[PDB]
Design a protein around this nucleic acid. Sequence first.
DNA 1: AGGCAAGC
DNA 2: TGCTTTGCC
Length: 225
Amino acid sequence: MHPFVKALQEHFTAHQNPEKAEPMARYMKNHFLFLGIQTPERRQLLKDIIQIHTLPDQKDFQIIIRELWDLPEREFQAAALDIMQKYKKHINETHIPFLEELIVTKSWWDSVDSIVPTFLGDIFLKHPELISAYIPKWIASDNIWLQRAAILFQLKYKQKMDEELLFWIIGQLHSSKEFFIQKAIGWVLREYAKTNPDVVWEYVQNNELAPLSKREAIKHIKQNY
DNA sequence: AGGCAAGC
DNA sequence: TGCTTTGCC
Ligand SMILES: COc1cc2[nH]c(C(=O)N3C[C@@H](Cn4cnc(N)c5ncnc4-5)c4c3cc(O)c3[nH]c(C(=O)N5CCc6c5c(O)c(OC)c5[nH]c(C(=O)SC)cc65)cc43)cc2cc1O
Ligand SMILES: [Ca+2]
């Protein structure tokens, strides 16, 4: 019902590509319909609408994202996250519950990974005293996407990584059977090893991990030991 | 530009 | 397992 969303829906729909829609949907295990609009085109179509309408007032940004989240085609959720990025300066700790909602609604790796290391990563850098109100809850929830959020919110931190916290989180989730948890553990360890390889190596040599997780973690540093 | 990052 | 095509940085 928001005019910005109505305009975006019309403009995206007018530029759909049925020939791309099928393999795009298959790539996400057919969890979602697709219009068939890949990222470069999608972002330019969004730009078109912003250039016509101007960016809506920040009082509207949650409403816009919610309405886009409810549309059937997956590009509307990807575009909602592109839009959320344009309100970056207005996003703060009071928005964590909204981000939780997005993580657990129409969940898959494409949306969850686009929410977590940027938006939640930045919030918890400014408010690290709020981590304990969320991360333990997420780990205990048995929702795999909140669990993956606990693992990956520090993914881009590099020298800012809280090492003891990262390793505690990983230890809590290492016995998960879930592909998306085993793989997230491998990813965050591999990535942090680009910054602090010796402590990742020590960790993986002295703490239990699923074999997927361990192999992925040491992919680039194993030839140094 | 190009290296590094789910599907099967 | 190690290749795919597309996306992030
Ligand atoms: C913080 O740091 C990082 C964050 C990151 N996010 C991503 C990311 O979000 N990715 C990377 C890449 C998915 N991806 C691709 N290639 C690889 N080799 C990958 N290895 C892992 N993932 C991979 C990808 C996304 C997200 C998406 O939402 C994606 N969607 C598609 C997609 O839609 N694909 C990929 C395969 C595919 C399509 C597609 O549109 C198609 O429509 C034409 C396709 N057609 C076919 C065929 O007929 S094969 C005969 C394959 C095919 C790829 C894709 C990368 C990335 C990197 C970082 O450092
Ligand atoms: Ca792989």
